[model samples]
Target: TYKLILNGKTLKGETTTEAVDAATAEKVFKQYANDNGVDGEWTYDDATKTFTVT
Candidate 1:
């Protein structure tokens, strides 16, 4: 499973998709950013398989 981390915190809510596809995950996070005004960047940790937004 893929993890979504925003601003150093793991987000797991009804809105968290946990998408396997990178594109889908990016879109999901971008959408979340759109609503939350989070102008962050993404880093995918290959070892942890986590999507980190900072």
Candidate 2:
């Protein structure tokens, strides 16, 4: 499973039970950036299984 953490907070309704895929992550990340006015990029680290935005 994977978790989407934006600026240190875990977004509601953004957790995944399956393996984190790029397509899904990209879509969700874009939506989050737009919804929250976050101006940055996202990267997935397989080692930690976390999606970090900065």
Candidate 3:
């Protein structure tokens, strides 16, 4: 029910998983990280319903 965000911006251009749990939220973000090879890290905020790539 949440979106994958990078630098507070939503990312929909990659192969990502938008699940309803933190476990898979981690996967989606990690998948984004692995697929994009970015320099930042991931922060999960389930309270805010966000998979943040910082």
User: Could you tell me which residue pairs clash in candidate 3?
Assistant: none
Clashing pairs in 1: none
Report the lDDT tens digits of candidate 1 across residue range 1-54: 566677734433323566767788778878877687666677787687677677
**What lDDT score is found at residue 30 in candidate 2?**
69
Better candidate number, 2 or 3, judged by lDDT: 2
Estimate, for each residue in 1-54, the C-alpha lDDT of model 3 and write its tens digit: 666676634443423465767786676667657776554666666687666666
Candidate with the greatest lDDT versus the true structure: 1
TM-score of each: 0.62, 0.55, 0.55
TM-score of model 1 (CA atoms): 0.62
Best by TM-score: 1
Poorest 10 consecutive residues of model 3 by lDDT?
Answer: 7-16
